[model samples]
Target: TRDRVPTYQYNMNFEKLGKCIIINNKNFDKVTGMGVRNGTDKDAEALFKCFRSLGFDVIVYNDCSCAKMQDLLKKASEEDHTNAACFACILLSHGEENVIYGKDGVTPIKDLTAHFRGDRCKTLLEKPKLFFIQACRPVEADFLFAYSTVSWRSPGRGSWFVQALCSILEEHGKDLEIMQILTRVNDRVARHFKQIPCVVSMLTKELYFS
Candidate 1:
């Protein structure tokens, strides 16, 4: 009974493979009146080009209603997306967790992406669905360091979250997993920046490109 030995084991049998589809939404107008913020279009264009350079089929949508967003995603899912392996959606607008702003009012953010879920949308099943949201989630700011004071009478500018997101995606996207990239984005916003940002996701698989 004393002459027993233990053996160490290791597993290294995984591979990374997939193309990417990027959907960027940047809204510059408000539901009732005008946008307090500028730079939505600029941000969207820059991000779209960046992802395109990374070999993603990038689509840019502006001033989309909830229904329009749904239609866009549904059509994309139904297309012969053989070249793409994963999906991404970046929403830049005023939002809460349950709702995102249209050109008129609030609409369920989930409604826009529900058409692409595994059971509902089989074409993208077992694939990654990445969502990057840049908007206000609540009326209250978490802390002083996370607050940005803007002029009341002037249009609002870009968010620090969007800036950090673009920077991280440009810097570390090629080297890290999608979740890691987003984690770093969260850390950068929570620690280094002076604005609090919110992120929500409904992903189902591991995604990495190297």
Candidate 2:
């Protein structure tokens, strides 16, 4: 596994698709006990551009308090997504091993997603709820995240994780499973550093996209 680059591929594209929400959390309040995440906005913007290039109708939220985050997601979860093929959300924030930080404080990853669970949000029942969080390995928050996949990039290039992530997706997204592509992200990130990209599925079936 050390010397081998995994070959995972498929075919998928943009005829019928859905909305992708990105909450680009950055800048911590002095009272939040978190430092300002200087590069977080870079990750958010990169992901916004990447997802848009892939045809996702992306929405970005710069920063929101815990309750504000909850309120926005709660309303989103209530919307009828029966017509959309899938839904995606990304979180860019400060985090530890588990929880992701909102502007005000830490939020357990699960609480934000619970609103969209199959039992609660019938509109998204049995569908894939994808999250690309720009943080550590975990379970909670409003939507998505991913740790940067590189040693780090020069200033202005953005995080290596988002860079590599966009690179592979550009080359193979229309030709692969979401899992395979992200696994590629996992493998790609692992090559240069200790970080490995992760994904959690609330999806009940196989998801194929290009």
Candidate 3:
């Protein structure tokens, strides 16, 4: 019998670590009755630098409409990920319950993520897909969600979640397991910023970065 070591980690062995999409929604349509989201730019830049440094093809989109947001991820899911490791997405915007606001209106979070399901995007099958959201309120296999705050609670000024997440990712991007890193972010936010972060993981195996 060939006894082998149990591998608990996802295969991050592809040449391309995959794309990191950052949708920073600052302005909103007057019809939507939503105001501007200040300080989101800082979050966007910090996240861009943090993930890019970790080897992702990071792209930033500002003030995308609901349809535009949908199209963006749909196109991403349709892309060939054969040589890519995984996918990561970040949404910085106004949200309520289970929906996030674009420049035009709100969209269900599920709709935005549905494109990457295994049956839909074959190349991303069995690969880790992360959704780190800074929604005021609100995952599917090899998927992880890191929420800024609990449901029904508004986030504080200056934003706590993104700051802690970017800081932790910068510090432990290549070392700790994904969950452990997220835990640190959770604690850091709660202790320092007084806002509790929530992490939900459906990752089939341990995830680590380069």
Candidate 4:
């Protein structure tokens, strides 16, 4: 009957494992209309350091092409299968629902993660393969205050989602599960005084940093 839902708290345990690969696609060669901001390199670097401080073997690639991104992910998955227990991929780029843009054009985001799915790459079969995508899904307008700020904006600019994501991970990643950290990121984006952004995750297990 109440218009607003009450907030509650719960506790749980999470396991920390494996290396994280942070891919920051900062620059776009052919951006449509108003491109993403030009300071994505700084964002990517900040993310790299944040993960590195968490004991993750973080690898950063700036302005990587789609082919290069695929290759890096495929190789990282292969290595994780051979040596680690869980894997993570953070993409800071311009994206659509199933696609992410490279320096040139769009490529399926699914294509990047499918390489580690159970049926295709058995090495990571039961293990976790986490992908955190910070991108726009489409050009539709929601009439929300947040949406109006960034909608109809051009491509190739860095996303506020990525910035907020890194900030949360840096502050809470050690004590929170990946999902928990991401939830905070979502909340921050929704209420923060900036462009609203989206976070898309395809995860199979409970993952943590510490």
Candidate 5:
């Protein structure tokens, strides 16, 4: 028999695949200077199905305030993930540079994701932490950031970036490396709409939904 190659990968074998938390911030308070994000629900729905099919427990929150967003994720971070493979958080909102908007105001993306850090969330230590931000853009080992666009850019109906992302994941989620999937997503968006999706990764091992 031929020798089988061993690839370094995050552990996908667990009692559960983990939770996929989606913060769908479509509506905004008029005072925040953020307009309604039409079609964001469609993106959320698509993402819900995509990640669910890949075996995640999907949780969705809509139109949260800055404090609410922080509270939700903080609560997630505090949960025991001993039986889980990884964690995923998706934010669909209005954003700039490093901040995302809630119904009331903006919060730094770092603060939102800081809860899952190795030192912060022990249950999730060494497990992959995936953040897919359709609004904008950060840290922690085993973390991956899939942004819909570059800094100072934006999202629409479903969003070109998310639409491409869901399509690719639906087709390749179980078989390809996470980075490879995002590269395909980048290509599809760039080729179809001339829009770019950014993937920032600090994962020390390969990741696959399977």
Candidate 6:
């Protein structure tokens, strides 16, 4: 346990790094009282491209029901990702505090992530597992969830938070720890978008893209 090497000083094969799952919930039912999340597909596509470029096995799921959402995570968690260095999941949709909107209605924010906690997903134990959640109203989910302190954006553009995150990652993903990358994202959003992010992290190790 006394041994230590800086992450930036090390180079790991991106191919074997990990998997990233993006749940791009762009469609919601107005009949169910949820509004259409118009610009979320752009965020999902942006992340998909970025993660793939960084060497992640990425999968994007368009509109899903609560059961479908839970099923996807359950399957991912149960798989043998022990060979992976980390895991990432992103949710883009319409939501309320502590709740995520499925195509038809709401599911507790915790339900989505509970499957990947160390006890539940042993294959990912001790590895950094990240979740990026964005919505019409944002989130209060578990580790690595982030959203806008306010959804400040041009109607034609993607959400400010996701856009900044994509740009920062594109520029520095292979060179910086996630914390450093996220800090730059925060600064960019604060300056250009004039807003702060609501990010929560309970990670136990440094998460670098490379």
For candidate 4, list the clashing residue pairs, or say none: 34-154, 36-156, 36-157, 37-157
For every candidate in turn, the CA RMSD to the true structure comes to 9.4, 5.8, 4.2, 8.3, 3.1, 4.4
TM-score of each: 0.70, 0.80, 0.92, 0.71, 0.92, 0.88
TM-score rank order: 5, 3, 6, 2, 4, 1
List the lowest-lDDT window of 10 residues for candidate 6.
Answer: 1-10
Candidate 4 per-residue lDDT over residues 107-163, each given as its tens digit: 886677766766656655555555665554411110110111222222353355666
What is candidate 3's lDDT per residue for 36-112, written digit by digit as tens? 77778888888999999999999999999999999999999999999999999998888988899998899999899
The numbered model that scores best in TM-score is 5
lDDT tens digits, residues 1-210, model 1?
A: 122122211111223222233333444344445353466656676677667655566667777766676677677657643344556667666665566676556678667666565666564455555566555531111101111111111124346566666688788766665557666766776676444444443443344443
**Any runs in candidate 4 off by more than 4 Å, and if so which?**
1-16, 30-36, 80-82, 136-159, 194-205
Off by over 4 Å in 6: 1-4, 7-15, 138-143
lDDT of each: 0.53, 0.67, 0.85, 0.59, 0.87, 0.76
Give one digit per residue, the lDDT tens place, for model 5 in 1-210: 122234688888899999999999989999987777878888889999999999999999999999999999999999999999999999999898889899999899999999999998999999999999988332377999999886222344568888888898888898888888999988988887646888998998888778
lDDT of 2 at 29: 90
Better of 1 and 4 by lDDT: 4
Candidate structures ordered by lDDT, highest first: 5, 3, 6, 2, 4, 1
Q: How much does candidate 5 score in TM-score?
A: 0.92
Q: What is the lDDT of residue 184 in candidate 2?
A: 85
Model 6 clash number: 0
- For every model shown, the clashing-pair count is 3, 20, 0, 4, 0, 0
lDDT of 2: 0.67
Better structure of 3 and 5 per lDDT: 5
